[PDB]
Amino acid sequence: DWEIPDGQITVGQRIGSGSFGTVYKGKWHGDVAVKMLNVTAPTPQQLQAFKNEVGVLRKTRHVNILLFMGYSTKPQLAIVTQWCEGSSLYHHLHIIETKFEMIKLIDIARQTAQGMDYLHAKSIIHRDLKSNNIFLHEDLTVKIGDFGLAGSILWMAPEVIRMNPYSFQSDVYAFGIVLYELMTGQLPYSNINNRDQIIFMVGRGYLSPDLSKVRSNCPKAMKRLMAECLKKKRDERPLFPQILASIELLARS
Numbered sequence: 001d002w003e004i005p006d007g008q009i010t011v012g013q014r015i016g017s018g019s020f021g022t023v024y025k026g027k028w029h030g031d032v033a034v035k036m037l038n039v040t041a042p043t044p045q046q047l048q049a050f051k052n053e054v055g056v057l058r059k060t061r062h063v064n065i066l067l068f069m070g071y072s073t074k075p076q077l078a079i080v081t082q083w084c085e086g087s088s089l090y091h092h093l094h095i096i097e098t099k100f101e102m103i104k105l106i107d108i109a110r111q112t113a114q115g116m117d118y119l120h121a122k123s124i125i126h127r128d129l130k131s132n133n134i135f136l137h138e139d140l141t142v143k144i145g146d147f148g149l150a151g152s153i154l155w156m157a158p159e160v161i162r163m164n165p166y167s168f169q170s171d172v173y174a175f176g177i178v179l180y181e182l183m184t185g186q187l188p189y190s191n192i193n194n195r196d197q198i199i200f201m202v203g204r205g206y207l208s209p210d211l212s213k214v215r216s217n218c219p220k221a222m223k224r225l226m227a228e229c230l231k232k233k234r235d236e237r238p239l240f241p242q243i244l245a246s247i248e249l250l251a252r253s
């Protein structure tokens with residue numbers, strides 16, 4: 001069982017704080033990441049969200065998924081995962097501007113599609129895939145998780161922006177935005193400074209990511225796949241088995 005024996009987890013540095021909880025770098029058979037709910041006594045809705053999160057996490061065992069390690073309920077509700085080395089894909093692309101070679105970019109894409117295909121096969125809809133939720137462990141392996149504590153409308157499919165509108169296809173749209181980030185090094189709609197206007201326009205189908213911005217060395221097949229994933233009509237979007245087969249085919253070139 002994944003219930004960690006009481007008084008074994010040690011929490012060190014606080015590495016993230018929000019309203020959905022606090023994340024600390026801890027110690028439990030080496031470095032771990034510990035997510036805790038700040039309140040000493042929780043709401044029955046909080047206990048349920050904890051149970052639901054452990055229910056999803058305990059179902060996952062794949063190299064491209066952040067490793068769930070266990071949970072504690074005493075003294076506080078805590079979820080323990082592995083401690084990664086490096087930074088998020090968001091950090092690489094948008095903050096430290098890491099210039100990865102095309103072969104490496106296609107690899108990050110393949111590994112993300114690999115983890116997304118795993119989640120979808122286990123009937124897990126991520127609901128918040130974005131480059132911040134894609135960790136580049138040892139600067140080599142994609143680890144997908146939900147690293148947040150709170151939103152992020154750039155990866156939101158038009159029907160999610162409108163109004164349950166979450167599906168395998170809405171995750172595919174967010175994956176298309178990630179491909180856009182990888183192939184352009186940029187976030188979409190960088191020339192618009194109004195949040196509400198982006199929300200309104202994506203939702204109405206007036207605004208769409210500018211594909212003319214993709215790198216010169218970006219394969220023709222990659223540009224096609226990106227456009228397919230970003231289709232305003234969700235039923236028109238390919239699923240991850242097809243996405244992965246498209247990435248693996250163009251990789252042999």
Ligand SMILES: CC(=O)Nc1cn2cc(-c3cc(NC(=O)c4cccc(C(F)(F)F)c4)ccc3C)ccc2n1
Binds near residue numbers: 016066125147
């Ligand atoms: C350097 C380094 O390692 N930093 C680091 C590690 N961190 C780990 C967490 C963290 C995340 C969760 N939950 C999920 O990830 C989650 C939830 C729902 C669905 C899915 C999915 F499987 F659908 F993806 C995944 C639980 C507990 C912790 C400790 C948060 C921030 C963080 N920062």
